[PDB]
Amino acid sequence: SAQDFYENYEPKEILGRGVSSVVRRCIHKPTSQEYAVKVIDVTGGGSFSPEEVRELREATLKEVDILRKVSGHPNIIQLKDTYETNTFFFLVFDLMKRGELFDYLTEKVTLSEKETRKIMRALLEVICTLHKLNIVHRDLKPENILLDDNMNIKLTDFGFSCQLEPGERLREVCGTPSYLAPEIIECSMNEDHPGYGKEVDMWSTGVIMYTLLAGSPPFWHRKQMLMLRMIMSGNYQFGSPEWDDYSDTVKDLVSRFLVVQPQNRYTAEEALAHPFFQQYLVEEVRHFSPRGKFKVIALTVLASVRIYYQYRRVKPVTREIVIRDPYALRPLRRLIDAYAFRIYGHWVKKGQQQNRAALFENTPKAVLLSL
Amino acid sequence: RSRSNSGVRLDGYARLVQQTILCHQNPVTGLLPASYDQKDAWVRDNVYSILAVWGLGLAYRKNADRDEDKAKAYELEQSVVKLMRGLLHCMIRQVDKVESFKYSQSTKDSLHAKYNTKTCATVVGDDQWGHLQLDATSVYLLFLAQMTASGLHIIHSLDEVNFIQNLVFYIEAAYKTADFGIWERGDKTNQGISELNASSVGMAKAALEALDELDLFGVKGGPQSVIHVLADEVQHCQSILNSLLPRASTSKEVDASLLSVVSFPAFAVEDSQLVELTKQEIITKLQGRYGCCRFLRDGYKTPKEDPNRLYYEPAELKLFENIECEWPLFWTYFILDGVFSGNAEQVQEYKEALEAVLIKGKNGVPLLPELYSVPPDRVDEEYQNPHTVDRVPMGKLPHMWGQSLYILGSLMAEGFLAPGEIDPLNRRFSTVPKPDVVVQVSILAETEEIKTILKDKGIYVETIAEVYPIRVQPARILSHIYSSLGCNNRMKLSGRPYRHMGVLGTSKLYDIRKTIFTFTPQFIDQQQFYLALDNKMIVEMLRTDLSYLCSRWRMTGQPTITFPISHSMLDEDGTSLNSSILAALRKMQDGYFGGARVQTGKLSEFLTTSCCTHLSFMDPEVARYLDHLLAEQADILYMLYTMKGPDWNTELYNLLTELYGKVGEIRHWGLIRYISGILRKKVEALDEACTDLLSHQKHLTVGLPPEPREKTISAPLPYEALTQLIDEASEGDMSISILTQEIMVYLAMYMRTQPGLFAEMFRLRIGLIIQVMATELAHSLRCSAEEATEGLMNLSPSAMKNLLHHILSGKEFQGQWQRRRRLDGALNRVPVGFYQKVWKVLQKCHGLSVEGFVLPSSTTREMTPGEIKFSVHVESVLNRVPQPEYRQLLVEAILVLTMLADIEIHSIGSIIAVEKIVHIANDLFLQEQKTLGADDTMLAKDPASGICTLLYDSAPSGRFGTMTYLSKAAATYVQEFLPHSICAMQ
Ligand SMILES: C/C=C(\C)CC/C=C(\C)CCC=C(C)C
């Protein structure tokens, strides 16, 4: 009841908004601890018919279930308790002072390699927990990802999640279009494909990699179905000048999640085993054959020499290179993107007609207007 | 047997007060002259200067067990009564001004700031001085309430009770009235321009709360002597204080007089974060080693101003920077804040700091200098190294205002007085958290047949007749009722003016002539406007109005909103309740709606758990009404009804409110709006609506784009003039006049609830808002502009509000970015700090020219980067391009200089044409696409601007983005003007 809601919490200010759900900050009176409450209008202002009123409850009743199946894990919010009324459904969870990753990705257009590594290190380690418990999300968008004051990822809105029965593969289309895996559309356009399994989350996570490190979705174009053929066919490019400055270890791991065929996809457990997420543990013996020692000393030299060489190569900003090609070189390109999102950062929102790629023009107008 | 040591040490304080303050009290009037040179008594200064006497009298009264220390306590107490009574006679001799100011909040009808200390007469005229100082009457009203609460009998007659009651209406509109303020100079420019200062708004809020249900006769008083204060105006002052702070006004980033609002004596700020943030802002920007500057660029007695000119020219403001006179008065406020807050450290750092600026005089008594001024020779040194040169004491010696709080602070810091004795009304607890209140709602049915529709949907309601003896009335009736509070025919006082009543007033239970009264909230009133005829808007207004209630209720009992369901709130069929209201009603039964706890019930159940205010002035026009109350095609008809002539408003008959009746039932918004224009139906809260937008550091422009016809609102305008300005700016078209004010409500609605949509717009241009809203509703459902013009009249208020939010929030339903640049440069939407970034660039240049209109670097010194006047100068240059889309091209072109300016060490040292950088960028955008395979067809020129239409549609970033070509052409122009350049820091 609503009395049970106000006997423990008091909502102070409005944090965010949604289609029918409102996120509101509250104070827990017994503990005086900051907590977020999401306030879903079940009746939805009267627009919801009794079916949607019932369906939203069943979706919400299910929604408590998954958030009740996963708990105590560092990188998904804890549904502290849930209150249901005839007209609302209150869900109290942790307070994330900073907003979604979309808002952050708007502030910093291109998210740096070190920062994304721990971001997704959590997300992949999030993905492992879901797959080990056999629960797929189907909704892994950055707006579904919440960040706290220490930048820690808090995956949010398992609203589209559903627990696969052991060895069962879904058919319903759930998810905003860009972040849908190729067989999501294929199952939508054919009945022979008997469904998709838990490998769906791998593609959605690999999409964040292209968005975070480049500021654009891997496949984006303004009409709806055209994006889909880029997805199922799987035509993606680490285009220039943007994607050449990043290290090569980035590219391969991006392709692994982005393979169109599900069985060859890079599952979460081995996903964390790719060279990017390797960590330097100080206490390792690391024994090596005499050839192995010789490489290390050679590689230690090869490294030092390399670092001097790479740096010597960086071209200081001069008048001419600005005139010929600003985007080509990193410091000016990241700047143009940065002041691109300060002027029109309000023009990026959730959906298809408001994605971040609308703020980037990487192709000639003629090729864009070819068809 | 002997006097206590407290009495002995008070004698030294008695000598200090007598030798410094009480020896100047006029024998006849009890007033205090400012100084020997300024032989007049200021209302604000006299009230402040009497605090030491009042504190001393309270300190002496603590031990009144002997004849002598009873008598000196009596002297100090009645000397305070003499001054406060003497100041009452000064204002009571200007009752004509008080009566006139209540209805027309003009400077020409304001109580005089200074009076004759010898005869309580006006020394100067209504125009020979800056007289409107709402923080001077409020400092009187606040302490009058406090001194009565402490036991001082100041008010002597019920006529003076009516006068003080009428003085409440005098200071009620402080949130919507511009005034010269605490420093009698208005804005920072000192040019006779009144502005909305937080000191006046804050002071009135505290005075209104201090006078709220206060018996002016003390304990031995009755309901006839009680001052009634409406929390609508009290919390409206809060909405302005929260928006203004930490700023003092739109022209002042900070004022040290805000110490008189955040801590003492106002305590007008309820958020402790705001108090600390504003106090620390004063710390960084104002305090030095000789006090605190009143406000940045003050120059009141700076040796760089001529003491003969009463006004300051615009260029003189930059001459006062960093050499402003410093007043130790504000350090007594910090001492007083520490005593109230309980920061012994604070009462120590500002006590030793003040003790080193106090100038010893007479027989060793400390004198508080009015200000410390920079010696004329040493002005250049403080220009370079701030707040280190030795200053000389100037101005008044002693500053009788500041001297009193110094003694008052000294009295309360050495245990001779407690914060509660100087603040008997407990204003010091304004910062303690207040829990949100449970809003009681009693849904009612206008007729029995509506009760069955609600019952069929499971809604427990009483009919309008079932509530009798409790009888419900429109919010207007309550406004008429208060027009009889403070009426005195002999004193020619007409009571409270007609002001719109919000929920905080209409959510109380009213006891008029022993009959309990509940008044319907105003947003459901349908006769005034058409915002109550959209049922989707009733929920939206109700949703915010409960949210306003729960967080801003400061009365005994719980608020009670009586919500009568009317036939208009039913469906078009007439047998079903509208879904939006239907959802709203069940929402309230479950106990939560709009962030507020709603305890739905019957009006009888809430009799004992509500604010039962007894309206004693009704106890033996509106009284006469209350005495009986206690006991072919429609579209064609307007063409008929407008070709009757200009609306004659008389009986040339052969009452459009009757014609307005059916259209409210059929809810055709295009027709109903036209009737509102031709009947001149006007909203009752546009003057708080404009003020709320104004108080958030915005300038409101209503009217179509051209400047002579588009009028800017920078100061809070009263209800009549603001509406007249809108009507005159309506250039005769009645449809725009309503849409202008209709959008104004929605702008204020979103401003109060979502302040983030206006962070990129510093000037709210309503007039083009209809235009920019027309284009998107023109491109959607593709049609002509005239059809869109007819279309714009046709949407529901909620749809109109949504579509405006569709405009402001940046959500999208020629080209994509052509529609995102015609919507970004037509609203003059600029990134956060862009006006603060032009200042940096102009210091590296000689100017910024747009279409051959220069914005020189002389502006950088003239106004500060954060000055909104500077924002106007950059803005004014940027509207020299008529076409909206090209303006945004100029806008991001300006920033590509900003980002290139940081990289470039050297300065261009000449003019830069922001327009041209787009043009070769258009030219250079041309060449690359030609080389890559663009046809002449796709690269088609914009007829007026000269930019390719594809360049308008091009994305901002990318290899081929608009700001890559403009980061490209912002270098060839620097080639010719700067032959040699050095770029560093990448
Ligand atoms: C490193 C910049 C290289 C080409 C661009 C040229 C820069 C400028 C021509 C002057 C514009 C702003 C100045 C603020 C001081």
DSSP per-residue codes, A185-226: HHHHH-SSS--B-TTHHHHHHHHHHHHHHHSS-SS--SSHHH
| Residue nearest to ligand 1 atom 15, measured at CA | B907
For residue B750, which of B714, B803, B812 has the smallest C-alpha distance? B803
Token pair in block for residue A308: 């001097």
| Residue nearest to ligand 1 atom 8, measured at CA | B974
Amino acid present at A296: V
- Answer for the pair B91, B138: CB distance below 8 angstroms, yes or no: no
CA–CA distances in Å: residue A51 to residues A20, A85, B587: 15, 17, 18
Distance B986 CA to ligand 1 centre (A): 12
Token pair in block for residue B636: 């064609």
Instruction: List the beta bridge partners of residue B711.
Output: B702
CA–CA min distance A274, chain B (Å): 30
Question: What residues have CB less than 8 Å from A114, skipping those under 6 apart?
Answer: none
Amino acid present at A355: N
- Torsions phi, psi of B253, nearest 5? -65, -30
Instruction: List the beta bridge partners of residue A217.
Output: none
Instruction: Tell me how far apart the alpha carbons of residues B436 and B433 are, in angstroms, rounded to a whole number.
Output: 9
Q: Which long-range contacts (CB under 8 A, 24 or more apart) does B412-420 make?
A: B412/B55, B412/B336, B412/B339, B413/B335, B413/B339, B413/B347, B413/B351, B414/B9, B415/B6, B416/B6, B416/B9, B416/B10, B416/B13, B416/B55, B416/B59, B416/B62, B417/B55, B417/B58, B417/B59, B419/B339, B419/B340
Q: Do B591 and A3 touch (CB under 8 A)?
A: yes
Does residue A305 sit in helix, strand or coil?
A: helix
CA–CA distances in Å: residue B986 to residues A308, A335, B839, B902, B982: 19, 10, 22, 9, 11
CA–CA min distance A27, chain B (Å): 11
Q: Do B984 and A327 touch (CB under 8 A)?
A: no
A139 a catalytic residue: yes
Amino acid present at A13: E
B903 touches A: beta carbon within 8 Å: yes
Instruction: Tell me how far apart the alpha carbons of residues B478 and B473 are, in angstroms, rounded to a whole number.
Output: 8
Q: Which of A110, A346, A349 to mutate to test the interface with B (most CBs of B within 10 A)?
A: A346
- Answer for the pair B736, B730: CB distance below 8 angstroms, yes or no: yes
Q: Which residues in chain A are followed by a discontinuity, with C-to-N distance exceeding 2.5 angstroms?
A: none
Token pair in block for residue B191: 């040019």
Q: Do A346 and B929 touch (CB under 8 A)?
A: no
Amino acid present at B83: L
Q: Please work out whether the CB of residue B841 comes within 6 Å of at least one atom of ligand 1.
A: yes
Radius of gyration (Cα) for chain B, nearest Å?
31
- Answer for the pair B417, B534: CB distance below 8 angstroms, yes or no: no
Maximum Cα interatomic distance, chain A, rounded to a whole number of Å: 76
Q: To 10 degrees, what angle do helices B785-794 and B766-779 make?
A: 110
Q: Given the CA of residue B975, which atom of ligand 1 is nearest to it?
A: 9
Question: Residue A233: enclosing H or E segment and its boundaries?
Answer: helix A224-233
Method: cryo-EM
Which DSSP letter does residue A65 get? H
Q: Which residues of A touch B958 (CB under 8 A)?
A: 327, 359-362
Instruction: Tell me how far apart the alpha carbons of residues B402 and B458 are, in angstroms, rounded to a whole number.
Output: 65
Residue of chain A nearest B921, judged by CA positions: A323
Judge residue A263's burial from the number of C-beta atoms within 10 Å of its C-beta, 0-12 exposed, 13-18 middle, 19 or more buried: exposed
For residue B258, which of B288, B229, B283, B231 has the smallest C-alpha distance? B283
Q: Strands (DSSP E) along B43-190, which ranges?
A: 114-116
The dihedral region occupied by B367, where left means phi > 0, alpha psi between -120 and 50, and beta the remainder, is: beta
Question: What residues have CB less than 8 Å from B972, skipping those under 6 apart?
Answer: A323, B920
Amino acid present at B976: E
Q: Do B811 and A349 touch (CB under 8 A)?
A: yes
Question: What residues have CB less than 8 Å from B198, skipping those under 6 apart?
Answer: B240, B241, B244, B245, B247, B248, B249, B255, B258, B261
Question: Residue B848: enclosing H or E segment and its boundaries?
Answer: strand B847-850
Given A6, A88, A361, which is nearest B954 (Cβ)? A361
Maximum Cα interatomic distance, chain B, rounded to a whole number of Å: 109
| Residue nearest to ligand 1 atom 14, measured at CA | B901
To the question of whether residue A18 is assigned a binding role by annotation, the answer is yes
- Answer for the pair B482, B212: CB distance below 8 angstroms, yes or no: no
Distance B365 CA to ligand 1 centre (A): 62
Q: Tokens 């401003």, residue?
A: B751
Token pair in block for residue A18: 């949604």
Instruction: Tell me how far apart the alpha carbons of residues B458 and B450 are, in angstroms, rounded to a whole number.
Output: 12
Distance B915 CA to ligand 1 centre (A): 16
Instruction: Tell me how far apart the alpha carbons of residues B858 and B76 are, in angstroms, rounded to a whole number.
Output: 56
Instruction: Tell me how far apart the alpha carbons of residues B815 and B184 are, in angstroms, rounded to a whole number.
Output: 54
For residue A92, which of A185, A29, A162 has the smallest C-alpha distance? A29
Cis preceding linkage at B265, omega within 30: yes
Which DSSP letter does residue B846 get? S
Q: Do A317 and B903 touch (CB under 8 A)?
A: yes
Q: Which residues of B touch A20 (CB under 8 A)?
A: none
Does residue B193 sit in helix, strand or coil?
A: coil
Instruction: Tell me how far apart the alpha carbons of residues B676 and B737 are, in angstroms, rounded to a whole number.
Output: 10
From A4, A41, A81, A139, active-site residue = A139
Q: Do A46 and B812 touch (CB under 8 A)?
A: no
Q: Please work out whether the CB of residue B837 comes within 6 Å of at least one atom of ligand 1.
A: no
CA–CA distances in Å: residue A266 to residues A207, A238, A262, A353, B72: 13, 19, 9, 30, 91
Q: Given the CA of residue B841, which atom of ligand 1 is nearest to it?
A: 14
Q: Please work out whether the CB of residue B971 comes within 6 Å of at least one atom of ligand 1.
A: yes
For residue B256, which of B355, B334, B141 has the smallest C-alpha distance? B334
Residue of chain A nearest B968, judged by CA positions: A323
| Residue numbers of B between 827 and 856 with CB closer than 8 Å to A | 829-832
The dihedral region occupied by B346, where left means phi > 0, alpha psi between -120 and 50, and beta the remainder, is: alpha
Q: Do B959 and A327 touch (CB under 8 A)?
A: yes
- Answer for the pair A199, A267: CB distance below 8 angstroms, yes or no: yes
Do strands B462-463 and B438-445 pair parallel, antiparallel, or not at all (unpaired)? parallel
Does residue A181 sit in helix, strand or coil?
A: coil
Instruction: Tell me how far apart the alpha carbons of residues B421 and B316 are, in angstroms, rounded to a whole number.
Output: 45
Does residue B743 sit in helix, strand or coil?
A: helix
For residue B316, which of B330, B328, B303, B329 has the smallest C-alpha distance? B303
- Torsions phi, psi of B76, nearest 5? -65, -40
Q: Please work out whether the CB of residue B900 comes within 6 Å of at least one atom of ligand 1.
A: yes
Do strands B471-473 and B515-519 pair parallel, antiparallel, or not at all (unpaired)? parallel
Does residue B688 sit in helix, strand or coil?
A: helix
Instruction: Tell me how far apart the alpha carbons of residues B21 and B46 are, in angstroms, rounded to a whole number.
Output: 10
| Residue numbers of B between 40 and 79 with CB closer than 8 Å to A | none
Q: Do A24 and B963 touch (CB under 8 A)?
A: no
Cis preceding linkage at B398, omega within 30: yes
Q: Which of B959, B960, B962, B972 to mutate to test the interface with A (most CBs of A within 10 A)?
A: B959
CA–CA distances in Å: residue B738 to residues A292, B381, B490, B688, B792: 83, 57, 41, 17, 12
Does residue A153 sit in helix, strand or coil?
A: strand
- Torsions phi, psi of A203, nearest 5? -65, -45
Q: Which residues of A touch B934 (CB under 8 A)?
A: 364-366
- Answer for the pair B299, B316: CB distance below 8 angstroms, yes or no: yes
How many CB contacts within 8 angstroms connect chain A with chain B? 182
For residue A14, which of A39, A42, A31, A46 has the smallest C-alpha distance? A39
| Residue numbers of B between 931 and 960 with CB closer than 8 Å to A | 932-935, 938-939, 950, 954-960
Which DSSP letter does residue A317 get? P
| Residue nearest to ligand 1 atom 9, measured at CA | B974
Token pair in block for residue B143: 């302490």
Task: Give all strands of the β-sheet with B911-913 in edge-to-edge order.
Answer: B853-856, B847-850, B911-913
Q: Do B899 and A241 touch (CB under 8 A)?
A: no
The dihedral region occupied by B361, where left means phi > 0, alpha psi between -120 and 50, and beta the remainder, is: beta
Amino acid present at B766: I
Half-sphere exposure of B428 (CA within 13 A, CB side): 16
Q: Please work out whether the CB of residue B75 comes within 6 Å of at least one atom of ligand 1.
A: no
For residue B136, which of B117, B165, B110, B161 has the smallest C-alpha distance? B110
